[PDB]
Design an enzyme around this catalytic site. Sequence first.
Site, PDB file in Angstrom:
ATOM      1  N   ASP A  54       1.134  -1.526   0.244  1.00 13.27           N
ATOM      2  CA  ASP A  54      -0.336   0.040  -0.207  1.00 13.27           C
ATOM      3  C   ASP A  54       1.312   1.393   0.033  1.00 13.27           C
ATOM      4  OD1 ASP A  54      -1.961   1.636   0.396  1.00 13.27           O
ATOM      5  OD2 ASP A  54      -3.261   0.263   1.498  1.00 13.27           O
ATOM      6  N   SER A 104      -7.218   4.548  -1.035  1.00 12.39           N
ATOM      7  CA  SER A 104      -6.726   3.686  -1.417  1.00 12.39           C
ATOM      8  C   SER A 104      -8.522   2.692  -1.769  1.00 12.39           C
ATOM      9  CB  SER A 104      -6.837   2.867   0.246  1.00 12.39           C
ATOM     10  OG  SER A 104      -5.021   3.774   0.648  1.00 12.39           O
ATOM     11  N   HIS A 161       2.260   8.177   6.020  1.00  9.42           N
ATOM     12  CA  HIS A 161       1.535   9.509   6.275  1.00  9.42           C
ATOM     13  C   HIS A 161       1.922   9.797   7.427  1.00  9.42           C
ATOM     14  CE1 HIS A 161      -2.167   8.578   3.899  1.00  9.42           C
ATOM     15  NE2 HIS A 161      -2.557   7.782   3.913  1.00  9.42           N
ATOM     16  N   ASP A 181      -9.962  -2.398   6.558  1.00 10.95           N
ATOM     17  CA  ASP A 181      -9.877  -1.589   6.050  1.00 10.95           C
ATOM     18  C   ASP A 181      -9.903  -1.338   4.053  1.00 10.95           C
ATOM     19  OD1 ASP A 181      -8.255   0.913   6.249  1.00 10.95           O
ATOM     20  OD2 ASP A 181      -6.179   0.308   5.759  1.00 10.95           O
ATOM     21  N   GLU A 205      -1.552  -8.666   1.268  1.00 10.31           N
ATOM     22  CA  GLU A 205      -1.100  -6.378   1.309  1.00 10.31           C
ATOM     23  C   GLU A 205       0.005  -6.231   2.297  1.00 10.31           C
ATOM     24  OE1 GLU A 205      -4.272  -3.871   2.952  1.00 10.31           O
ATOM     25  OE2 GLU A 205      -3.763  -2.257   2.395  1.00 10.31           O
ATOM     26  N   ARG A 255     -15.685   4.266   2.201  1.00 12.45           N
ATOM     27  CA  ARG A 255     -15.242   3.035   3.428  1.00 12.45           C
ATOM     28  C   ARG A 255     -15.448   3.055   4.871  1.00 12.45           C
ATOM     29  NH1 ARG A 255      -9.113   5.314   1.918  1.00 12.45           N
ATOM     30  NH2 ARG A 255      -8.828   3.323   4.129  1.00 12.45           N
ATOM     31  N   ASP A 286       1.767   2.085   3.340  1.00 14.70           N
ATOM     32  CA  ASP A 286       1.064   3.252   3.000  1.00 14.70           C
ATOM     33  C   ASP A 286       0.922   4.317   4.905  1.00 14.70           C
ATOM     34  OD1 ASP A 286      -1.410   4.512   3.566  1.00 14.70           O
ATOM     35  OD2 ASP A 286      -1.025   5.598   1.763  1.00 14.70           O
ATOM     36  N   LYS A 287       0.755   3.809   5.991  1.00 14.95           N
ATOM     37  CA  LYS A 287       0.389   4.259   7.221  1.00 14.95           C
ATOM     38  C   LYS A 287       1.204   5.231   7.689  1.00 14.95           C
ATOM     39  CE  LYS A 287      -3.110   0.215   7.848  1.00 14.95           C
ATOM     40  NZ  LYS A 287      -5.044   1.434   7.476  1.00 14.95           N
ATOM     41  N   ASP A 296      -1.369   0.596  -4.133  1.00 19.63           N
ATOM     42  CA  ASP A 296      -2.813   0.985  -4.750  1.00 19.63           C
ATOM     43  C   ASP A 296      -2.300   2.707  -5.915  1.00 19.63           C
ATOM     44  OD1 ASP A 296      -1.655   1.434  -2.846  1.00 19.63           O
ATOM     45  OD2 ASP A 296      -4.067   1.427  -1.637  1.00 19.63           O
ATOM     46  N   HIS A 297      -1.995   2.815  -5.630  1.00 21.79           N
ATOM     47  CA  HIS A 297      -0.924   4.206  -5.773  1.00 21.79           C
ATOM     48  C   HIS A 297       0.904   4.471  -5.186  1.00 21.79           C
ATOM     49  CE1 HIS A 297      -2.094   5.121  -1.069  1.00 21.79           C
ATOM     50  NE2 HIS A 297      -2.570   4.617  -0.940  1.00 21.79           N
ATOM     51  N   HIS A 322      -0.943  11.635  -0.774  1.00 25.06           N
ATOM     52  CA  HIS A 322      -1.218  10.068  -1.536  1.00 25.06           C
ATOM     53  C   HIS A 322      -0.442  11.162  -2.601  1.00 25.06           C
ATOM     54  CE1 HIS A 322      -4.530   7.090  -0.284  1.00 25.06           C
ATOM     55  NE2 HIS A 322      -2.945   7.511   0.863  1.00 25.06           N
ATOM     56  N   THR A 346      -8.158  -1.509   1.411  1.00 23.59           N
ATOM     57  CA  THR A 346      -7.092  -3.072   0.919  1.00 23.59           C
ATOM     58  C   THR A 346      -8.013  -4.541   0.491  1.00 23.59           C
ATOM     59  OG1 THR A 346      -5.550  -1.827   0.532  1.00 23.59           O
ATOM     60  CG2 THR A 346      -4.940  -3.667  -0.212  1.00 23.59           C
TER      61      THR A 346
HETATM   62 MG   LIG Z   1      -4.651  -0.548   2.527  1.00 24.36          MG
HETATM   63 ZN   LIG Z   2      -3.782   2.760  -0.132  1.00 25.27          ZN
HETATM   64 ZN   LIG Z   3      -3.488   6.204   2.310  1.00 27.88          ZN
END
Ligand SMILES: [Mg+2]
Ligand SMILES: [Zn+2]
Ligand SMILES: [Zn+2]
Lengths: 449, 449
Positions: free
Chosen positions: B51, B102, B331, B153, B322, B166, B327-328, B369-370, B412, B155
Amino acid sequence: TPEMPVLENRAAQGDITAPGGARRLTGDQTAALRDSLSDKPAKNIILLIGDGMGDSEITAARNYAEGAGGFFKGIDALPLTGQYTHYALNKKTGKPDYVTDSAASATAWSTGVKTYNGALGVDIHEKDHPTILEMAKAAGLATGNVSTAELQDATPAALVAHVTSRKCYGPSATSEKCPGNALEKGGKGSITEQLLNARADVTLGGGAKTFAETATAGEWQGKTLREQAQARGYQLVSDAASLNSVTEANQQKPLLGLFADGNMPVRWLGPKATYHGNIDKPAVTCTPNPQRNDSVPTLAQMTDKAIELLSKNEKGFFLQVEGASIDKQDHAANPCGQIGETVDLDEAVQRALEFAKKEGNTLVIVTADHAHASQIVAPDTKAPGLTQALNTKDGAVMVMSYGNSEEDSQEHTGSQLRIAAYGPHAANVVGLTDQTDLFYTMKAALGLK
Amino acid sequence: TPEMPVLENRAAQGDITAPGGARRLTGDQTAALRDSLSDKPAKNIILLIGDGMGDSEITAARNYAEGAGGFFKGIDALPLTGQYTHYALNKKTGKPDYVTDSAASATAWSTGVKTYNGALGVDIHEKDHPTILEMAKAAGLATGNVSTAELQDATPAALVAHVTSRKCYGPSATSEKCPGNALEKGGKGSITEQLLNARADVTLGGGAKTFAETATAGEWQGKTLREQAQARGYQLVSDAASLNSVTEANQQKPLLGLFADGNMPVRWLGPKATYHGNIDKPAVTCTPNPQRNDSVPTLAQMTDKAIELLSKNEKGFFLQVEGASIDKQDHAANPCGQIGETVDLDEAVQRALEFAKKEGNTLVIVTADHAHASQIVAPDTKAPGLTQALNTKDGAVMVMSYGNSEEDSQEHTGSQLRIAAYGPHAANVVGLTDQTDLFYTMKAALGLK
Ligand SMILES: [Mg+2]
Ligand SMILES: [Zn+2]
Ligand SMILES: [Zn+2]
Ligand SMILES: [Mg+2]
Ligand SMILES: [Zn+2]
Ligand SMILES: [Zn+2]
């Protein structure tokens, strides 16, 4: 009968809001890819470099000029892709320096050896290493070096010069900055002097300014580098009309095109990104530069003329083409300049691909020297740096951000980035590779020793 | 006899300071690429998602953990690579929204349709579209959904839930945020209730907290979602010992592993990046998280057990894995957490590749994902955001920067990013593709209708 295909169309196939409408593929790609693989030798090689054109610069440019579901007919059409690493070395320690400049990266793909930031054509021990252009010339191939930057700039200079500092443009900077390379100290000379000695069949770009300097020693001491150039048989050209007038370029009459004093003009204008510009200011639409000119050849025109001239050599040719200002405008935090320069490079890639598809023995490679600063962020973003909202072809707004420097110039970054190729030996760019593998791949494809 | 090779070693071949020492290749790659191309049907598919793992995250993690010239034995060993776009759509206008979240990206590869940020398994008209997991299960294939995030979550939820937001984790958030999906309003239910109805053979991750909620309507009204799970025949497991004890997972005894209340623990600790941290503070060395545990399975362990259980199904299987916290941690502006999560995913990719290489009919795909915020910048950089100096495996320092948000969370970004694959149908990830193309490639490879 076997021919190698270029992706004709990878645009979203239909309505992006509906099932399958955003797909870029129309069917299985296996057979297409099998047809793209060839270990036959390359007769020619066209290397196109977008300075600072990492994936983020390609995405931002595509979004703005072709829409998110669009496709660059040049940059996006190469079928074999991978990602490569471009880290430099710390001079003192010999350990990796994760973020390279344009000089050390250029040397890596042109010589096959990693070097320190700022070096041109020498390793960390300041020893010279032969370049792919010099080796091409030695095997008897035609050679070209085209760029929109000053020809003394790092990217085109790396093919013809070997100096300890990229700043040693002419006789004066060299005496003070590269004493050991200084002609009057017995060295090979400044970047411009070594460029004139290298004698590529076709050299086109900006940088006329430095040719005003006069040599401090040597056979042409006392006269300008421009004078030395004509004295040594170069055909000097300085506008598009003259460029088109050229019908042959070779070792007897090598061509030298000086189209601007410094860098050639940028294609599009736009205001600079500013703090909170996406929130505080209105969205921008880029405007063509009224002074880019009918008398100034574009990068695609230069590419075409270079191809025409160099292809008369039955032995084959090596040509490097640089879309120089993507990087410079990225440093300037100017979205429009930056995007315009990627669009401009796309047109030159299209020319190269047309020739290659028809000729059949040409390896075309499109890539960048290192990554850069611009990031595509959400529209409501409140960022610590410089931002700008742009009105894209889709009719939507895209926000770009430059947030890696409190200084004036936005900096390079070390992310690996895309490399893509088409033609005999393109398989060697797929997967993870290093920037120095590029030197070996091109040396092997051409069969040089 | 034909077998498909994985890149065995793309680490720099020698002394990075010497000619050709930084090369990752040892010879022409044509034959090897020709041997990687196959249109044979895929019996199985292993989809691994980092992620927020764009090219920049991969380079930063490689530099730190393997050195600039090193090589991730999982992440970097996939032979067919390309770049893909992941833009989402503005719900109101249907125009591209350049930076996806996501939820919209996972919906794109799991349904084949673009959607708005925040949606799971529905299009901009809020219509449900079947996912690759639901279609696989309908054709009789075994299915697995593994993640280190809360199973609610974006994903892992995208494969089994269809809600308009979400945020609709369980009954309470659903009643208030997704009224139309709320069970007591006649809807399909919250994310967790739809996950329990989807009944994949193997689901493993965090998110036990939400299972403490009680259903508002339906056959299991009044009891906890945990209770419903046991009532419907799921094997509930919550530590690594229990996970290892499982010898079968199928439609009669589907497995549900809840290893943490929220997200499972991160592998490495390190301080958060700070303003001028590369200048003001000393370089950081990451340290293994003492609470990551002997009783908590690692992503690679989860991947192994999922593969063992799903491979007993003679029909084949679809498995998505995943590495959620890259990603987390990105952030959070925490380099060590972010890199540790990338290293963790590399181990899981290694297990999937071992199986695939030996099985011979498995498509393994590794992508994100991005893209995300982190950038690798020069050591002396004075940036407007959060930075941090790290001591890498090379013994040099690498500086990481987060400069795209003045808020608390780093954002992102929209750059296109790497997609790499191995096995039958992997040719379809090469060149430029869209994230929705991935749904079509998987569906075709498994031969689903
Ligand atoms: Mg995710
Ligand atoms: Zn994501
Ligand atoms: Zn994110
Ligand atoms: Mg340049
Ligand atoms: Zn550069
Ligand atoms: Zn630059």
